[PDB]
Amino acid sequence: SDTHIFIIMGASGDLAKKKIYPTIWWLFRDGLLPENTFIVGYARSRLTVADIRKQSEPFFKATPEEKLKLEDFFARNSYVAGQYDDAASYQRLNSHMNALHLGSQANRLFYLALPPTVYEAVTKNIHESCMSQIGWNRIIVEKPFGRDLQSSDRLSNHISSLFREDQIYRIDHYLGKEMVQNLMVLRFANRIFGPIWNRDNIACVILTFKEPFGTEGRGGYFDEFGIIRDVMQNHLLQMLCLVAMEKPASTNSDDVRDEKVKVLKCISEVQANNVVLGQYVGNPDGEGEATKGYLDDPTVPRGSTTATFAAVVLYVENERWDGVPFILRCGKALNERKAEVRLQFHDVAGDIFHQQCKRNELVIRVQPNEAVYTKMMTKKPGMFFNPEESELDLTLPDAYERLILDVFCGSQMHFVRSDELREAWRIFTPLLHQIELEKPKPIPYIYGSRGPTEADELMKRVGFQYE
Amino acid sequence: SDTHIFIIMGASGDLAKKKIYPTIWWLFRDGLLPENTFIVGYARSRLTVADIRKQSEPFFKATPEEKLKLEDFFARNSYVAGQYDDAASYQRLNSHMNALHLGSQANRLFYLALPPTVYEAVTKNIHESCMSQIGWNRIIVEKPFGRDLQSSDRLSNHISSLFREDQIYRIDHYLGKEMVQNLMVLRFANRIFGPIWNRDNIACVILTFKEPFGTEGRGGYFDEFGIIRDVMQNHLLQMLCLVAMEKPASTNSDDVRDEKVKVLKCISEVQANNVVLGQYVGNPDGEGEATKGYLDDPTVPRGSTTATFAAVVLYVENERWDGVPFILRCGKALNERKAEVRLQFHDVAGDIFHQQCKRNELVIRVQPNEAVYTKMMTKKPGMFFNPEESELDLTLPDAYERLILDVFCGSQMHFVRSDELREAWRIFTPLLHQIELEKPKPIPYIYGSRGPTEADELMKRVGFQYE
Amino acid sequence: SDTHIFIIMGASGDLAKKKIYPTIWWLFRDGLLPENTFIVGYARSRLTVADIRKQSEPFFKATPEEKLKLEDFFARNSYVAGQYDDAASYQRLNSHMNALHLGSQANRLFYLALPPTVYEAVTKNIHESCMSQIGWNRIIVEKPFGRDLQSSDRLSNHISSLFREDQIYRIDHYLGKEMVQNLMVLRFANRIFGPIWNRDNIACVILTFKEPFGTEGRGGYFDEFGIIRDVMQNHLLQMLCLVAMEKPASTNSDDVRDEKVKVLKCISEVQANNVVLGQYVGNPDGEGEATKGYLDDPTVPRGSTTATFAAVVLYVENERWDGVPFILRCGKALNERKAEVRLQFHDVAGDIFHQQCKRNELVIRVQPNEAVYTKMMTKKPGMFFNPEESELDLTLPDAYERLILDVFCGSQMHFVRSDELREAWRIFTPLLHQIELEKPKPIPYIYGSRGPTEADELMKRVGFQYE
Amino acid sequence: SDTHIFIIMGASGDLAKKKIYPTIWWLFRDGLLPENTFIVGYARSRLTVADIRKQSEPFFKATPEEKLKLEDFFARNSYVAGQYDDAASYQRLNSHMNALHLGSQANRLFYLALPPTVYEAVTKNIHESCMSQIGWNRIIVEKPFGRDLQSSDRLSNHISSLFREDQIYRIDHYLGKEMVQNLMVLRFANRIFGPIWNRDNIACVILTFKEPFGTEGRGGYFDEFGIIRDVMQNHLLQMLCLVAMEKPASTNSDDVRDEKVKVLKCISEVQANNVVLGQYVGNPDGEGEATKGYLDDPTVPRGSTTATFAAVVLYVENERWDGVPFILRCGKALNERKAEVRLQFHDVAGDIFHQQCKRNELVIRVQPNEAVYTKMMTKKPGMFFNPEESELDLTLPDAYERLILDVFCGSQMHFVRSDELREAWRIFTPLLHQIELEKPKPIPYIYGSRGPTEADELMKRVGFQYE
């Protein structure tokens, strides 16, 4: 009902032209955005709505059946050209927004789709210039959230001195939000999985994020950060919080993020003896990009110690998870594209089936195909007592569209908080400093393989049983 | 490899010609019996193998493809005519076995398919004359096992003074042996269902055995015993033992029957305030037998207070099942054929889903259409935290063939023991004495219904939350 | 070192001269305060240090041995005469504080011991002038913290707009801090009482606070608040939070108050059917004040429905405490002085001792005679299996001295938080509004009795088994 | 009434005159024996009541006050001289017993206090001649119950072919029967110790039986058996059964021995890698027998590897005790006399006390100075959250008198059964056969020390945390 404005900061950027504009396109096409919604593209380069349309339509996946809808979408679009650290551009932007249908009363939604080196300046100018005095104001902040505990604290302190937590929306591109809700309903609305969700029954927790592609083209951008900062400290650790949390007081966003930050407070700093780092190398038997390793990219500096694979074992030190390993295994250039939560349960206390029993498993897969199945054992049909391992299944805008829909709706549950981010960086900062100080050489693994075998050895050591 | 003999006592009886000969037919046809197996029918009236063929073939369900195999099977059988209480006849039958290929060294298997009023004489004569000195001897005792604690005690004392527990096989026609193994493997090989199998999680247990037909023709025989002795005293109580048993020390038959009798030893005597007794009456809407009531059968004595339906709540007072109701609901002429084990779980402690969750259920249906499925809630596809109830499935000679194969193989796990049988009557004897002493009037219910609503009121009172 | 200043707001009040001067005197006498500490009294009446001496010496309970040390303590005292709502008075008080040894660098602590209506002006004036620019500043706020959710929210919002939670110290005079630490260590450092601290084992929780004396003198002031607001809203509910809290992430003050707030957030509003209200009436026999009832006090308004006793059942609707009653029983003019936490455990699952077992209890008595004892069953010596009830013991400035020491050391664990207080008032606000709207008549009970019988009936109804 | 006869088989032996006659003295002196109790000594040497008096009075420990009652006890006694393998002597004994006041109607109770090589003939002669046709018959059998599985099965099969389990009373001199009942009431009547009695909480179980003296003169008798067959196979393993048993269906003896044998069936055979065997050596610094080693005894054969100390770790592979070690530590000539049960509990999940908490323990000391106490952490009084470990106590004929009283009363709970003994010998037979075949050398330890250090290393290896 209320009129809204979708503000794309740095709309000329690659991310804005490939993932955000198509994602508001698909959201307006499906009728999910509020009826009165305006898109204002703001960047440094002087462009028009026609230029943005021309440069973004290939990624729109447009069809001839909806050219009228496409024209309606682009009639709601607007562009303002200005520097990110020049105030005059910001009051020009604010005057443009006020020069709209109920622009002053409109709810303003900022998306910061620009390099993080200017987040300070952009947030400083937005607070003084482009706020709305009637409707709410919300900024979407993209990763990276700094690289250390100190930098993350300084950016978070700046933003929280300007905004409040109700206005900060730190987005996580890899959070499905549907399998997360499946997790919460499964382990919180069912008594089957309630009492068994603790130390006494679960042996280990494996949180996986594999990508079959390396760092083609954009290897220099990945070099400065590494796979830990890329995936593990934010996405896999948020999945750890969702898996290991206590039952919240309610399904409110704050009541869930409190449980997540409480789980984070129980995790101690990472020790390097529980970390296996890998770096993919070219495959001689490959066909395309498989024949080029991480160091083969001309944008990667020579002798780069950046790891494209990492397996890290964490321990949530509370009553429910003390001593249970949490193996965060993520890496690039692996054999498949997988992202799942895997729980191995303990062997049954007292075996009457002559060591034929296997550990029960509960897998919550997000990528490529969503599934929730339990690998438990049922009796093999016949005339004889032996269990057999059987896979039993227990289970549409994608993750990004629904995340933007949460930002519109104000559901901040699936976004990392400030204290949550501080604990997430506290867990990993000493290990990252040690890695970037000593520069230990990562274990090379072949492109398309399963990663270094030392990661498998570490998983064996911590108490993981693989068939 | 070793030769076997299958002795059918009372082969001229209805039970033999209707259930036994087809069952051994299906066991021999499927190539499951030992190759050297002899069948020796014995009854009072003078018959031959040809007479048995003429009276039995329509119930064989044979096909023209296997008429040669049928001829081979009937060239293997034999008949002996003699009284059940004459030593000379038993000596003749023993000689008849001795006049067979390796007959003296054969394993002898006696099935008691004759009225229980003469078991006292028949077992005595069998022990006196027909016993085997080399091969094992096994007798299969058909229900009824007496009418109360005293009659069952005297019969069991006689049989155990003659034979040992390794030789007694008290058969349960309604026991699947397929879903029982599924139960044991499900709850004993899986940690998913291990910790939750107790008071803290399971709210109530429903053990159901319904039949869509009444007591046509043979209602007079049912009159003297009633539905309690007919189904509930033995079959439903064995199912209760299998559900409530502790994990045995091994998969041995004795190690399982010890747990069964231990479970029976902690069930108090049945009180009349936990029992709902009903009698099916005609459904004037008719259709067939439905328009004839229990008392409308001329074979039933006038003014018969025999209950064709019974709902009884039992409490296994031990550390695992204290306070958890065990509702045995069995009846005749009900709405459908069903035999299932249903476990309601408690509501989740602390509801963050606005009273939308329902009690989880684990259902182990024995017949028809064997299945093991849990009613647990998944996330409703959509946009919000909405739980919806979903049925998730977790799952070949019939039961009688697999039970006769148990007697052949010596597996005595699914047969009731003497101490187990004595505990079964100590739980039901006071109630039955009260019923046939005071002679209460059962609540009449229409043919084809779900039973008297007083049973539903009883289940609701004891803690069964029916949605 | 690090010189301190202890500013006692309201130096002429009864609370000051009767409890605060003795407490700080005992703190210095025991050598517990920092060596450099100054006590600056401030009130409206023109007084001196000698007037403070003459008005407060009866209550120091001093001895002639330490009269020199008493003189030393009074040599560190001072008085400032100024109105509570005069800016010049606070300016001269700030100048007086600066006119001390290392005064500007001193840590300032203001004890607000003045009537509730004046906090609004006093906090504002203190924040305007009397703040310290170098050392820390802390305020100690005496109850009442408003009369309902609205008044408490107003006062808390004012104070939080002025001060931060690190500076607000809401004092609870009834909180032992010695048996509370014993409770936390007992239930968090021991595996004996760890697993059993949940629904599955605990039947009901009784939190008790009884006084043997009535409302002599201070009767009209008690009239406007009632026993609920006086004791149950703050002290008994904090005891409930301590009993029902999960294990905090650490022993830090914030980590404990977070668990306390999470416990409070899981408690629904109090219903009038779970409340029993009593009002003590004069015991005809008596000896003294027992002859005088609540309305017999001339200062109590006629026809007062104020309850001097209250029994309230609370339910913490979370995973650990769903369905477990929390019976808060507080009252005045009862049979004995008592303040204890009593935990009844369930009956043992399966009784093999012929119903001779009583429910196990864990009692943590705070006053009188601080003790921790559990009532479990031990075998009666002899030749028989006859268990018998046995009491087994499981277990220094007073509570107020250690509470002021907490404010000096900054240990804010034992002080209620703004959100904690908001939740506490949210729980009780509808019930109190109904009480002072409908004006129910409390059940009159004899002075020196155990309270109205309806409280015992309520405990019996909710599941309390009294031997 | 119901006249009783106490037959001491082999009354001329050391065991009778040193332990049994004083025990019946103390039983009749305290008025615990039935009033019509006759004592009949029977052995080879031609003796009289006066001679038994002369040889046994020094061990009677009587007083001149009760010297009058002494004759009354000796006025009920009688003696028969006969060989143990002569039917004429046993017929004479039967006639002598029949030549008593209501001797034919009397209850006959035989004590077998004669060498085990003669038991086979003695039991046969008793069953042939001396059995009672009216009252009950009970035989008390002394250890050893054979040397291994084969001999024990032979003896038990012989006795069971002669007598039934209601007549066989296998005595255990070291079973207190007083602290065992305390343990049962503690863990079965209380929920404080109920849910914590499993894998999830208990880390290890230590079963101790120490003696400060070595083989004094009877080293030759101990040489053929060893400390395993001496104490560990029978007494410590019965303690293991009592600790690890599930809650019986009742307090009946049969229901308890059923659980004991069920626990025994869940114990795998002992492996030599979980066994530490020791042999004590003389201590130069000693004064008396401490200076003489095991091999220094002339009655001990030269080059004897008989173990006088043994530390053995067992595992009860069932649902409640999977992976929990059961360390049986017994030895002779140790530092102190002790026989206790110690249960170490796991570390609390999540330490908020900075690695200060120690594992909770529950100690049930049987001898000396019977006591039950828990070592659990309570807060150290002061100004800090630091717990301290404290010992909190949870707590008359001696053990042998109460055991004979159990035999008289028919309480068979504390006597080992046939199948119990079968499982007990099955557990230890492979290890003992390996010991007697390979003949390993035990680790020498100093007389009066704590035992070999390898035992401590084994306890630390299996999971025992020593402070």
Q: How far apart, in whole angstroms, are the C-alpha atoms of residue C135 and residue C123?
A: 18
Among residues C301, C304, C289, the alpha carbon closest in space to that of C212 is found at C289
Residue type, D127: H
Catalytic, out of B4, B96, B235, B414:
B235
The single-letter DSSP state of residue B299 is: T
Q: Within this chain, do residues C241 and C356 fall inside the same structural domain, yes or no?
A: yes
Residue type, C47: L
Helix (H, G, I), strand (E, B), or coil: what is residue B273? Answer: helix
Residue type, B367: Q
Bridge partner residues of D379 (DSSP): D387
At residue C378, what are phi and psi to the nearest 5 degrees? -120, 155
Bridge partner residues of A389 (DSSP): A377
Q: How far apart, in whole angstroms, are the C-alpha atoms of residue A144 and residue A123?
A: 15
Bridge partner residues of A364 (DSSP): A341, A372
Q: Which two three-digit tokens encode residue D326?
A: 């059961």
Report the residue count for chain A. Answer: 467
Pairing verdict, β D339-345 and D325-331: unpaired
Q: How far apart, in whole angstroms, are the C-alpha atoms of residue D317 and residue B324?
A: 28
The residue segments making up the domain with residue A62 are 4-142
Told to judge if C4 belongs to the known catalytic residues of this protein, a careful annotator would answer no
Bridge partner residues of C339 (DSSP): C209, C367
Which residues of A are known to be catalytic? 235
φ/ψ region of B323 (left if φ > 0, alpha if ψ in -120 to 50, else beta) reads left
Whether D47 is covered by a domain: the verdict is yes
Q: How far apart, in whole angstroms, are the C-alpha atoms of residue C420 and residue C262?
A: 9
Describe the strand order of the beta sheet including A4-9 as a list of residue ranges.
Answer: A77-81, A37-43, A4-9, A107-112, A137-141, A168-170
Q: Within this chain, do residues C357 and C244 fall inside the same structural domain, yes or no?
A: yes
Q: How far apart, in whole angstroms, are the C-alpha atoms of residue D249 and residue D235?
A: 24
Whether C171 is covered by a domain: the verdict is no
**Which of A32, A192, A253, A406 should we substitute to test contact with B (largest number of B Cβ atoms within 10 Å)?**
A192
Chain A touching partners, 3 or more CB pairs below 8 A: B, C, D
CB D313 within 8 A of CB D327: yes
Method of elucidation: cryo-EM
Burial of C454 (0-12, 13-18, 19+ CB in 10 A): middle
The single-letter DSSP state of residue A70 is: H
At residue C196, what are phi and psi to the nearest 5 degrees? -80, 5
The single-letter DSSP state of residue C233 is: I
Whether D405 is covered by a domain: the verdict is no
> H or E element: which one contains A460?
helix A453-462
Shortest Cα distance, chain A CAs vs residue C392, angstroms:
27
Contact call for C395 and D378, based on CB within 8 A:
yes
Bridge partner residues of B340 (DSSP): B208, B365
- When divided into structural domains, chain B yields a total of 2
Bridge partner residues of A375 (DSSP): A361, A391
CATH of residue C83:
3.40.50.720
**Which of A254, A256, A352 should we substitute to test contact with B (largest number of B Cβ atoms within 10 Å)?**
A352
C4 appears as a binding residue in the annotation: no
Residues of C with CB under 8 A from a CB of A: 194, 246-247, 249-250, 255, 258, 262, 265-266, 318-319
The sign of the dihedral angle between the CA atoms of D408, D412, D417, D421 is: negative
Among residues D181, D195, B411, A247, the alpha carbon closest in space to that of C195 is found at D195
Q: Which two three-digit tokens encode residue B74?
A: 């009937």
**Which of D200, D247, D257, D262 should we substitute to test contact with B (largest number of B Cβ atoms within 10 Å)?**
D262
Report the residue count for chain C. Answer: 467
Residue type, C442: P
Question: Binding site for NADP(+): which residues of D?
Answer: 10-17, 44, 119, 143, 329, 338, 342, 365, 373-375, 393-395, 450, 466
CB A52 within 8 A of CB A11: yes
The string of DSSP letters for A138-150 reads EEEEPSP--SSHH
Q: Find all residues with CB under 8 Å of C366, minimum gap 6, and list them.
A: C176, C178, C179, C180, C339, C340, C341
Residues of chain D found within 8 Å of residue A348, distances taken between Cβ atoms: 319
Contact call for B345 and A191, based on CB within 8 A:
yes
Please write down the HEC assignment for all residues of chain D: CCCEEEEEECCCCHHHHHHHHHHHHHHHHCCCCCCCEEEEEEECCCCCHHHHHHHHHHHHCCCHHHHHHHHHHHHCEEEEECCCCCHHHHHHHHHHHHCCCCCCCCEEEEEECCCHHHHHHHHHHHHHHHCCCCCCEEEEECCCCCCCHHHHHHHHHHHHHHCCCCCEEECCCCCCCCHHHHHHHHHHCCCCCCCCCCCCCEEEEEEEEECCCCCCCCHHHHHCCHHHHHHHHHHHHHHHHHHHCCCCCCCCHHHHHHHHHHHHHCECCCCHHHEEEEEEECCCCCCCHHHCCCCCCCCCCCCCCCCCEEEEEEEECCCCCCCCEEEEEEECCCCCCEEEEEEEECCCCCCCCCCCCCCCEEEEEEECCCEEEEEEEEECCCCCCCEEEEEEECCCCCHHHHHHHHHHHCCCCCCECHHHHHHHHHHHHHHHHHHHHHCCCCEEEECCCCCCHHHHHHHHHHCCCCC
Q: Which two three-digit tokens encode residue C187?
A: 């239930």
Residues of chain A found within 8 Å of residue C194, distances taken between Cβ atoms: 319
∠ at Cα D314 (D311, D316), nearest 5°? 160
Whether B219 is covered by a domain: the verdict is yes
**In sequence order, which ranges of C4-75 are alpha helices (DSSP H)?**
14-15, 21-29, 49-60, 67-75
**Which of D352, D386, D413 should we substitute to test contact with C (largest number of C Cβ atoms within 10 Å)?**
D352
**Distances B266 to B260, B369, B421, B460, D194 between C-alpha atoms, Å:** 11, 33, 14, 24, 19
Q: Which two three-digit tokens encode residue A196?
A: 């068994």
Domain stop point among D142, D160, D189? D142
Report the residue count for chain B. Answer: 467
At residue A429, what are phi and psi to the nearest 5 degrees? -65, -50
Shortest Cα distance, chain C CAs vs residue A266, angstroms:
6
Q: Which two three-digit tokens encode residue D380?
A: 């150290």
The single-letter DSSP state of residue A235 is: I
Burial of B323 (0-12, 13-18, 19+ CB in 10 A): middle
φ/ψ region of A198 (left if φ > 0, alpha if ψ in -120 to 50, else beta) reads beta
| Cβ neighbours around A403 below 10 Å, total | 23
Pairing verdict, β C168-170 and C202-210: unpaired
Taking every pair of C-alpha atoms in chain C, what is the biggest distance, in angstroms?
83
φ/ψ region of B448 (left if φ > 0, alpha if ψ in -120 to 50, else beta) reads left
**Distances B141 to B138, B159, B162, B405 between C-alpha atoms, Å:** 10, 10, 13, 15
Residue listed under structure tokens 């400093």: A433
Describe the strand order of the beta sheet including B361-367 as a list of residue ranges.
Answer: B387-393, B371-379, B361-367, B338-345, B202-211, B325-332, B309-315, B275-281, B443-446
The single-letter DSSP state of residue B416 is: B
φ/ψ region of B369 (left if φ > 0, alpha if ψ in -120 to 50, else beta) reads left
> H or E element: which one contains B263?
helix B253-264
Q: Which two three-digit tokens encode residue C6?
A: 């202890």
Among residues C359, C363, C374, C267, the alpha carbon closest in space to that of C321 is found at C267
At residue D343, what are phi and psi to the nearest 5 degrees? -115, 110
Q: How far apart, in whole angstroms, are the C-alpha atoms of residue B267 and residue B421?
A: 13
Q: How far apart, in whole angstroms, are the C-alpha atoms of residue A57 and residue A438?
A: 47
Residue type, A87: A
Among residues D267, D317, B412, B196, the alpha carbon closest in space to that of A353 is found at D317
| Residue among C199, C321, C350 minimizing CB distance to B266 | C350
Among residues D406, D425, D459, D358, the alpha carbon closest in space to that of D155 is found at D425
Residues of chain D found within 8 Å of residue B249, distances taken between Cβ atoms: 262, 265-266, 318
| Residue among B193, B377, B381 minimizing CB distance to A189 | B377
Q: Within this chain, do residues D214 and D328 fall inside the same structural domain, yes or no?
A: yes
Whether A66 is covered by a domain: the verdict is yes
CB D42 within 8 A of CB D11: yes
A229 appears as a binding residue in the annotation: no
Among residues D247, A201, A378, the alpha carbon closest in space to that of B188 is found at A378
Shortest Cα distance, chain D CAs vs residue C195, angstroms:
7
Q: Within this chain, do residues D137 and D184 fall inside the same structural domain, yes or no?
A: no
The sign of the dihedral angle between the CA atoms of B132, B138, B144, B145 is: positive
Instruction: Print burial letters for D49-82: b (CB count within 10 Å at least 16), e (below 16).
Output: eeebbebbbeebebeeeeeeebeebbebbbbbbb
Q: Within this chain, do residues A115 and A253 fall inside the same structural domain, yes or no?
A: no
Q: Find all residues with CB under 8 Å of D428, minimum gap 6, and list them.
A: D228, D229, D232, D233, D269, D270
Q: Within this chain, do residues B55 and B193 fall inside the same structural domain, yes or no?
A: no
Residues of C with CB under 8 A from a CB of B: 199-200, 266, 317-323, 349-351
The string of DSSP letters for A287-298 reads SSGGG--GGGST
User: Which residue of B lies nearest to A386 if distances are taken between CA atoms?
Assistant: B185
Bridge partner residues of D445 (DSSP): D280
Q: How far apart, in whole angstroms, are the C-alpha atoms of residue C191 and residue D349?
A: 9
Bridge partner residues of A340 (DSSP): A208, A365
Q: Which two three-digit tokens encode residue B15?
A: 């039970």
| Residue among B248, B345, B387 minimizing CB distance to A192 | B345
Contact call for A318 and C194, based on CB within 8 A:
no
CATH of residue C402:
3.30.360.10
Contact call for C387 and D248, based on CB within 8 A:
no
Q: How far apart, in whole angstroms, are the C-alpha atoms of residue C349 and residue C343?
A: 18
∠ at Cα A13 (A11, A16), nearest 5°? 55
Q: Within this chain, do residues A10 and A71 fall inside the same structural domain, yes or no?
A: yes
Q: Within this chain, do residues B184 and B108 fall inside the same structural domain, yes or no?
A: no
Among residues D460, D8, D405, the alpha carbon closest in space to that of D177 is found at D405
C154 appears as a binding residue in the annotation: no
Residue listed under structure tokens 């021999």: B28
> With breaks defined as C to next N over 2.5 Å, after which residues does chain D break?
395
Whether B311 is covered by a domain: the verdict is yes
Q: How far apart, in whole angstroms, are the C-alpha atoms of residue D294 and residue D303?
A: 11
A450 appears as a binding residue in the annotation: yes
Domain stop point among A92, A121, A142? A142
Residues of chain D found within 8 Å of residue C191, distances taken between Cβ atoms: 196, 201, 345-348, 359-360
Question: Binding site for D-glucose 6-phosphate: which residues of D?
Answer: 143, 173-177, 211, 230, 332, 337, 367
Q: Within this chain, do residues A118 and A196 fall inside the same structural domain, yes or no?
A: no
Shortest Cα distance, chain B CAs vs residue A194, angstroms:
8
Residue listed under structure tokens 């789709």: A113
| Cβ neighbours around D309 below 10 Å, total | 26
Q: Within this chain, do residues D116 and D191 fall inside the same structural domain, yes or no?
A: no
Residue listed under structure tokens 């006959």: D108
**Distances A56 to A24, A49, A61, A111, A405 between C-alpha atoms, Å:** 12, 10, 10, 17, 21
| Residue among B184, B192, B352 minimizing CB distance to A196 | B192
Q: How far apart, in whole angstroms, are the C-alpha atoms of residue B397 and residue B28?
A: 12
Residues of chain A found within 8 Å of residue C246, distances taken between Cβ atoms: 246, 319
A37 appears as a binding residue in the annotation: no
Q: How far apart, in whole angstroms, are the C-alpha atoms of residue A257 and residue A415?
A: 8
Describe the strand order of the beta sheet including A387-393 as a list of residue ranges.
Answer: A387-393, A371-379, A361-367, A338-345, A202-211, A325-332, A309-315, A275-281, A443-446
Helix (H, G, I), strand (E, B), or coil: what is residue C162? Answer: helix
Catalytic, out of C101, C127, C158, C235:
C235
Q: Which two three-digit tokens encode residue A421?
A: 């981010």
Describe the strand order of the beta sheet including D4-9 as a list of residue ranges.
Answer: D77-81, D37-43, D4-9, D107-112, D137-141, D168-170
Among residues B400, B398, B413, B391, the alpha carbon closest in space to that of B368 is found at B398
**Distances D159 to A106, C52, D197, D371 between C-alpha atoms, Å:** 97, 94, 37, 38
The sign of the dihedral angle between the CA atoms of B24, B27, B28, B32 is: negative
| Cβ neighbours around C345 below 10 Å, total | 24
Helix (H, G, I), strand (E, B), or coil: what is residue A37? Answer: strand
Helix (H, G, I), strand (E, B), or coil: what is residue C332? Answer: coil
Q: Which two three-digit tokens encode residue C234?
A: 């703050």
Q: Find all residues with CB under 8 Å of D67, minimum gap 6, and list them.
A: none
Domain stop point among C127, C142, C157? C142
Helix (H, G, I), strand (E, B), or coil: what is residue B387? Answer: strand
Chain C touching partners, 3 or more CB pairs below 8 A: A, B, D
Contact call for A258 and C262, based on CB within 8 A:
yes
Q: Within this chain, do residues A312 and A428 fall inside the same structural domain, yes or no?
A: yes
Whether C204 is covered by a domain: the verdict is yes
Shortest Cα distance, chain D CAs vs residue C354, angstroms:
9
At residue A240, what are phi and psi to the nearest 5 degrees? -60, -45
Whether C222 is covered by a domain: the verdict is yes
Q: Within this chain, do residues B138 and B199 fall inside the same structural domain, yes or no?
A: no
CB A205 within 8 A of CB A343: yes
Query: How far does Cα B321 stand from its chain's mean position?
Result: 23
